[model samples]
Target: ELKNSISDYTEAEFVQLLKEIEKENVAATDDVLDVLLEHFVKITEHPDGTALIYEAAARAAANPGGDGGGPEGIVKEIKEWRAANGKPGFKQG
Candidate 1:
């Protein structure tokens, strides 16, 4: 878990770590998700709520071509990516 692996850092620090990871094209591992989920779960204590936030962010990040290619296309792509890769449940947060 990222919480275990990076427990020494604050939330902002962890986010910065993720930003660097993204810049490096490093895949967000389950550990990363675990850290994010744990952070949210501590505040909301609801897995569903945490998942919603995560999914939204994922969708936004995966926006294709950055042209806002209509909601339907974006949703479709996000769903497809989730089903295929088991990454974030959907792609925007």
Candidate 2:
């Protein structure tokens, strides 16, 4: 399926394509995966698409901290607490 279609491209190229597709928010007619792949192909053919893809990723990663609570705030708190007390090592039953 996905591997078969883009098997010719390097891993970096394929991943870049996927990023571009995600940024474009392309619609899928039948299969969502195919739509995503199609958008990737479109980006692969265009240079400007790369910047758009990266911007989309950056935006997605951004999380503003606030009093209301958010994932980043929660993660920051957890990290600080872990730093002060240390994290427990994994245990197997």
Candidate 3:
């Protein structure tokens, strides 16, 4: 496998990663997820990734499966969007 991190992800790779995360509902790769959790800014603002993510979000907004259908309904999604797209949010201890 051509394993790697976000720093080396091509524009296409970044786009694909968001699409993949959307389809998979989770990052699906520990190192890959770690890479996202690591960047928290750069990748989220690449202008390419968000392009894909907005598409993903639109799909969710259309249906809003609301996994477990609880308090986090859209709250979790919002935070993930912020974190994935390089925006700051309330960090808890």
Candidate 4:
């Protein structure tokens, strides 16, 4: 089972983290998405919600070129990367 660590906050605080990601200006990278995927998978149970997180990351930081072969492929890449790295689930810290 997935445990949610990111949702442990007020709605205000949670949205603010998205804004902070904009400030970091590093949200365009898969490495960063990997960071989010670790937490988001716990809460995002729908395809819409999955893309919601992905879109928010792009919106917060900066728009990117492609959908990385669309959202499905993007998630696949992340999952594959995780599997290759021996990271089977959400990574804390």
Candidate 5:
């Protein structure tokens, strides 16, 4: 059985943690959806995440919010070239 980590939190802490999730979107990746999956699987006792997972998968496949008005992938392509030819990757400090 999945352990109830959410139950371990005090009411205030739980509310705060949930609020913080939006402000601190994890690692810029859907890898964090693992939490929703886990919750739905054993705690919520419903496929609450099933429809969401489907939408998410479809959106990912389509890739919304395209950086239009330019050659697609141009930024990344330039950044890749600049990685060794000059400065580090855009995120590297």
Candidate 6:
């Protein structure tokens, strides 16, 4: 109830918003989705956030020691590994 800025939004609030969207996709129209996606991309573009995301992708793919230069590189490694092992890439879009 004391939220004052975008950073005030907590993980719980994010989950709640996600749940609301799950309950009714109409609750998040195309415009809303685009706005959220834009913000997400922006956040990921930040240096700290970018490192966090790159680490997360590496962790997800169980390659925690390698750095492909950036998030895209990490994802490329993951996709390559998955293909070699007969698995599909994640649905990011």
User: Candidates' TM-scores?
Assistant: 0.30, 0.26, 0.30, 0.37, 0.27, 0.28
Q: After superposition, how far is residue 51 of candidate 2 from its true place, in Å?
A: 24
Ordered list by lDDT, greatest first: 4, 3, 1, 6, 2, 5
Q: How much is the lDDT of residue 33 in candidate 6?
A: 51
Q: What is the lDDT of residue 51 in candidate 4?
A: 62
> Candidate 5: where is the Cα deviation over 4 Å?
1-3, 24-28, 40-93
Residues 32-77, model 4: lDDT tens digits:
5555554454433333544655565554346465444333333434
Candidate no. 6 TM-score: 0.28
Of 2 and 6, the candidate ranking higher by TM-score: 6
**Residue 28 error, candidate 3, Å:** 11
Model 6 clashes, total count: 0
- How big is the positional error of residue 90 in model 2, measured in Å on the Cα after superposition? 33
Predicted model with the maximum TM-score: 4
Q: What tens-digit string does per-residue lDDT give for candidate 3 at 10-89?
A: 43444454444444444355555545433423534434443334344555566557541321222344356656767653
Clashing pairs in 3: none
Q: What's the C-alpha lDDT at position 49 in model 3?
A: 43
Report RMSD for candidate 4: 11.0
Which pairs, if any, clash in model 6? none
| Model 2 C-alpha lDDT per residue in residues 16-81, reported as the tens digit of each score | 445445534433234554565444434233334334344444555563335213222222332334
Question: What would the per-residue lDDT of candidate 1 be over residues 54-74, giving only the tens digit for each residue?
Answer: 444555578656532322332
Runs of candidate 6 with Cα error greater than 4 angstroms are: 1-6, 20-28, 44-93
